Amino acid sequence: KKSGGSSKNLGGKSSGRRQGIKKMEGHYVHAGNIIATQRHFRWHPGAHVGVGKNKCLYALEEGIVRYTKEVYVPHPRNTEAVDLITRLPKGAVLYKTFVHVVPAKPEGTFKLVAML
RNA sequence: GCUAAACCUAGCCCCAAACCCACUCCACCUUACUACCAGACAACCUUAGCCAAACCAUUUACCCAAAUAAAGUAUAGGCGAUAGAAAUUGAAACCUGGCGCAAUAGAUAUAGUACCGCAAGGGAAAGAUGAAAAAUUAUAACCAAGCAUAAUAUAGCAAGGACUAACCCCUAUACCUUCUGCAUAAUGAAUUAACUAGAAAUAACUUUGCAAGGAGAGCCAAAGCUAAGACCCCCGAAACCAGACGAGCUACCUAAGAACAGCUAAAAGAGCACACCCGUCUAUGUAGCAAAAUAGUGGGAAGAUUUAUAGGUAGAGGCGACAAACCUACCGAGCCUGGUGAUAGCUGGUUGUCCAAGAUAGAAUCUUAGUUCAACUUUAAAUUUGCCCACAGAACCCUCUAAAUCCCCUUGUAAAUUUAACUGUUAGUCCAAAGAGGAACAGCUCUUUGGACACUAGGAAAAAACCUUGUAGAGAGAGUAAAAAAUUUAACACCCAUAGUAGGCCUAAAAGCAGCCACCAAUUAAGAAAGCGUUCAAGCUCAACACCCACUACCUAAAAAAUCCCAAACAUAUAACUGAACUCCUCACACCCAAUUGGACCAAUCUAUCACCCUAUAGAAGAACUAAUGUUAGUAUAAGUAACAUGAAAACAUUCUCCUCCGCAUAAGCCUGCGUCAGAUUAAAAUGAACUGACAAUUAACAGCCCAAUAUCUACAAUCAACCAACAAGUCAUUAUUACCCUCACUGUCAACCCAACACAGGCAUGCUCAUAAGGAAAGGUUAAAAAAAGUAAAAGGAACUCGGCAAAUCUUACCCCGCCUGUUUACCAAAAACAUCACCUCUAGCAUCACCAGUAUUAGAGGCACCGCCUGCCCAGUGACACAUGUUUAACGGCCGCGGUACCCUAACCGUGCAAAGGUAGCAUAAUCACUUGUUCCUUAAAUAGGGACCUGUAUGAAUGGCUCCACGAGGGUUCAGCUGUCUCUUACUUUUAACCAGUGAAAUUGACCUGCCCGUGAAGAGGCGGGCAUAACACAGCAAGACGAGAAGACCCUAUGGAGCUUUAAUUUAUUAAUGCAAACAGUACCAAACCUGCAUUAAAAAUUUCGGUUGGGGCGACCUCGGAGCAGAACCCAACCUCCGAGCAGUACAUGCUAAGACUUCACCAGUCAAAGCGAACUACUAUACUCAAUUGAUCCAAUAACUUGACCAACGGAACAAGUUACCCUAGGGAUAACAGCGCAAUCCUAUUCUAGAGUCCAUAUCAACAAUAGGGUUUACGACCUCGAUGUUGGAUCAGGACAUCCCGAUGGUGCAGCCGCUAUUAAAGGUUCGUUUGUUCAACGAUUAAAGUCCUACGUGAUCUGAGUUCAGACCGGAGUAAUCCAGGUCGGUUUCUAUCUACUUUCAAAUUCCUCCCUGUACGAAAGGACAAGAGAAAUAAGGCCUACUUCACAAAGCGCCUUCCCCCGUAAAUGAUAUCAUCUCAACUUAGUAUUAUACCCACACCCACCCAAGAACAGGGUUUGU
RNA sequence: UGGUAUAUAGUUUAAACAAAACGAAUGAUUUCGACUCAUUAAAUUAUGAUAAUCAUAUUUACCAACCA
RNA sequence: UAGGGAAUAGUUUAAAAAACAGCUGACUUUCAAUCAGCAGAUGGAGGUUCAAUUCCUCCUUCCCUAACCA
């Protein structure tokens, strides 16, 4: 009988992006394999780890994935990060979580091919 | 032992072969089956649609002249669904058979007959001996249901375990379907027999053959190829189209006919009133007399009347005084056949045994009742890891610094992935936990984690979701698991008090105690005062001393609903026992999940070959029925029930009694259908006969069946036809000339009769009779209960009944609304205010040989309004029409304002301003007119939501969509005087019918099976069937209607379906058709130019056609929403919903290598799409965090179109998008749904109600006489909501009548406590449910108001108790009006008039709770107690009444061997809330859940009933039957 | 019963610390008056809290309703 | 309860203008009319934009519509 009002909120129907870690600590990866996806920089690229447009971390070499805590030093051109470290107390250091790939195989080997 | 059972032929089916094709005579196209006369009418012309496309709109296979192959190829196509060649290639061919049926099969077939239908057309059923029936006292018996032989004994899904024993004991909630879940009161089923339902490609698998080849040309082939085997149901709509058949009913019309007494007036669409026509109201009837009737009452009855006969109009239609009427007994558009096995995402159904595995995140979708992908699940195969998991490791911003997860060697285990091939599931329930919404309600809704259920067992009482427990068998063995409810409450001090001082101040006063300051001090000891109190004072307590032991607790305070409480019981014998399908023991072992899937066996039948008292191995298939409101047949149940029938006596000769609705004849129709003989047949009836067989019969004068030609003639009604007067202007006639001498044939003739399925209470024209000279019988017999039906009479009253004076009686006044009037309509729920109508007005048309019309603008046609009377106002902006250059037109569609201010208020002549085409004029007005509204006032009634007259901005009155008056009329609606009455107070008596009993005959719906109880509880939420209790030998008959969610009709309300149809339109598409215009074509004439018809191509109208009308949704509608991104819910890998909470997007800017290419990866849970990228080529570069731009989303598939190419194109926003389609249905239809609303129940308790706790405030003071705020704690289930659990193959819904059952939260009556209780009246609380709780006016009302009363006129529940008991005013279909909405169809919370209420009782229950009675008033006490006065009791006692219950007839009254009331008689106990004594714990006191005493209690008292084979028969104050009483009154 | 509005001099009426209006008085003015002008008197439904705002009950207004 | 629209000088309208009203004068014996001058406005709050009656958002007042079916 008595009619009621409607909800005034629209949208909010987006689905999950299925982002996060794809390769955990100790996993074996091949060159090109995506290690992690993210919308903001939660994990930073370390050794033999590339970063794409969308902050996607991928393996540059074949090997084992490792996660570490390292000291963060921004690039001087980056003004937002450089305007933050100049306001820190003398003695403080910023830390961030980096992901690395420890290579497994060597670049190659020298083989005998002829005896001239 | 009956009924029955059983059979093998009749013939039929599919092929082959072969082309096929008459006859005695007579008759047959007119009314077919009819001997015989003047004619000329003639045949051809695209099938459409269902359906498919999941809608639909282009489109959607249908032999078309050779099997195979080419080939499902070329090609076509909303390039979708699907459709689909050819060239070319090139085979075989002996009718006489059957792994076909065998009487529900096979042809429908014993036959296109019987029968149904006007017609087209539809369309059956069944038989059974034997060699011989010229062997008929024959051919044995044994078998379905149903019965009989032979009824029954506490108790219960009917059995099982058993047992000496049938029953008694113990255990046990029918089946199918459908669901989250059914004993469910959800579906289907009476039962027996028979019949009745899974059809196939692709690929793959299995088993042979051959093998780089296979195959009996085609084709395939990187082990393939050939062959075989093995997988895809049944019934059902409303509809659509084509072609036939129908106007003997009905609607209208044509031709020529008929009927209408009597009276009044004599003029009549006049009145009274027969025949006749219609069908107003009431009752009855409701499977009937009747698929629309009967009785009574009513309307009309010389006209727009009624009616017989023949003919005409036919479904894309007709007809229509429009009711969406009627067109052969369901017309929103007929019937039949066919297309047609229409379609159905929907319901129902789906047939042998046994084992095994087996419950599922989600996405898209005109999609959420479905489907596809994924996920889960199954089988086969290959391979190698899967599950469990150690450290280490995974973010800052930030609020819960969460339980956890992700990753993961070891370890313990045995699964996992991949490949191949498939189906089903995709409508979820509770519990725990984390949360969202709602109300920190819901058996509520939405997500997540896990569990259980949808499988077994045990337990929690019964029990889907809680606990225990799972792997299957036998056992008269054992050990265990879970598993039983505990609690009982409030005593408390005694004793004593002098003084500075009335401290100071304030104050009228302030003295311990209104306020401010101080708060010192006397006495052994006592506050410049802690609580009451006083106007201020007085006055009473507390803190003090003394005395000596109060020598305490300071942890909780209640309860009430409705049929009947609910196991029975128990405080004391030593913790162990009982207890499963778990586990052990002896033996055995494939032997307990829906859908789905895999596998092992098999009945019968046919065929091949065996076999040979009924089998084997194989091959085949119409291969298996406890269920489809299934089909046919048989037989039960209801049920020997409902219902049906014959006037009397007698010599069967006749007579008597009573009806007379008639009767006789003709026409029509029918066709031998009560004449004789006979009968085994038949009626209720083993004389009669309408049935069977034979025989006979209706005789023409009545009637029917007619006529030579040509030309020609026919002005003057009828009505007693004469006066007279009319309009509606009428039914009757010849002559001339020619031709023409035979004559009585043929047919109908009966009856008790036709149309309605009937030997039907219906329908049926005319003449005479008009109450009969003709024709008929209401009672089978008895009894004389209820209820019911039809009548008669009724004391006193006289509408108090009721929605209403319905009905009955009686013979009557006045008024209002609507419509003028007679008239017409929804055959079968509406007769009316609706339609028509005289009159008025608008529009169109200047004319002839089939309508209008044999007419000509004083005409005809299309429409509106509705006689008359007074009137019909303003608007042409918009739409339309006309005219076309403006323009014209509303008696065409339609429309006809607002703001602010001013005379005290109200109002505004007036002032200011804007808009419009014009601004609602006259009039009327609380209306039949949205709501407000029961508006105000007068009349009317004792009392008025009624009615009438007025007042009235009515903001939604209003003028030919006609407005306002006024005669007459009305089965219209409303009010009323008077009278009348059984309508009512308040019923009663009698008669008839029915009824019951006897006799005869003998139905229907219904039926899972039944060995068919009550209470409470439980439960799919309302139990005869479950749990706990109570009750209980068996059995008929008559009554009742509370229940069996009783019977009946697959709900008509509501929702759903990409289901239908009707109507409307500014929905989409289209103009075939019709009309007009233009061009062309055709055609001619003297640079100009050609009539029309016809054809083609365009344009514009008209009138139509086809198709559709999205979804989500705490039912639908309205509103809102539909794609993408960020945040929270979701805290830590990923994922996660709500019509949940917030913020955003549908770009922009910079580059111009945002160039080419390419490993490896992520992925919005599928697909599609989307995303990140090393190296490399080529560039750039030595500075630019440059080498995939910044930016969060910043977006759109295929086809198609454009384009030379590159490339571009949709707010396809319903955003995975249909190339293009809206409304309405109450005129509606079909399929379903309790998956989904409205009534009811159930849950919940926000709202509502009640109580308690708290003590601010009110009450002069005074918190608790009384009332009560802010809040708190519980309970109730009467309101309004919310939820969607049972029911939509039906649970009938308001109020009232009838009868009431129950709760107490008590309205009166009773007993008590308190009072701001003097008394009389009251307020409040405790206890009490035995008894009682009125009549009236308006309203449909429940309520409410009012009038008069009462001791009181209680609150609630019982399916808002009760419709198989009633009522239908209201609500709530089909008709209609008003206002409003809309272009219209149509619609509204609106108002108004009208509108069919079925049921024969099978079961349960009940049908004498036998018998104590309640209250008011009067007198008296008493003018007493009380009291200033006014005023005015209780108790005791007495008397008289009312009601109720139970009886009776002396009188009265209705009546009369009797029954009744209006009359008379009788009527008997109590209830418990408290108030008081004695007296301990606690030596006072204290009514004591202390022992005890009293008010103060009934084994409710007693009363009633109490014997028993004379009993055939009769009588009765006894009674339905039976029974009972009497007969010492059995001629 | 329900909610929704409600209140201001003596009345009438904006607004609450109280504004204007009718009437009253007073003068100014006129030969005297009316008009006019000026001046004066005159009020917040009352109860409890915030401290002047919410409540509290009244007060009259205002619409709502058995049901099928 | 749901939904749409509106708010501009004291008043009524327009896309920051007019009209009156008001104030100041002239004309008239006086008033009115007339003539000549002067003033006054974007309900409220918040935000974008250099700039907002003119782009959005919430609140107040008022208006209109719907509030249905059994």
Ligand SMILES: [K+]
């Ligand atoms: K369809």
Ligand SMILES: [K+]
């Ligand atoms: K047959």
Ligand SMILES: [K+]
């Ligand atoms: K059920």
Ligand SMILES: [K+]
């Ligand atoms: K049912």
Ligand SMILES: [K+]
């Ligand atoms: K059932």
Ligand SMILES: [K+]
């Ligand atoms: K069934």
Ligand SMILES: [K+]
């Ligand atoms: K005819």
Ligand SMILES: [K+]
């Ligand atoms: K069903």
Ligand SMILES: [K+]
């Ligand atoms: K569906």
Ligand SMILES: [K+]
């Ligand atoms: K004092």
Ligand SMILES: [K+]
């Ligand atoms: K006959």
Ligand SMILES: [K+]
């Ligand atoms: K009849």
Ligand SMILES: [K+]
């Ligand atoms: K006679």
Ligand SMILES: [K+]
């Ligand atoms: K009729």
Ligand SMILES: [K+]
């Ligand atoms: K009538």
Ligand SMILES: [K+]
């Ligand atoms: K016009």
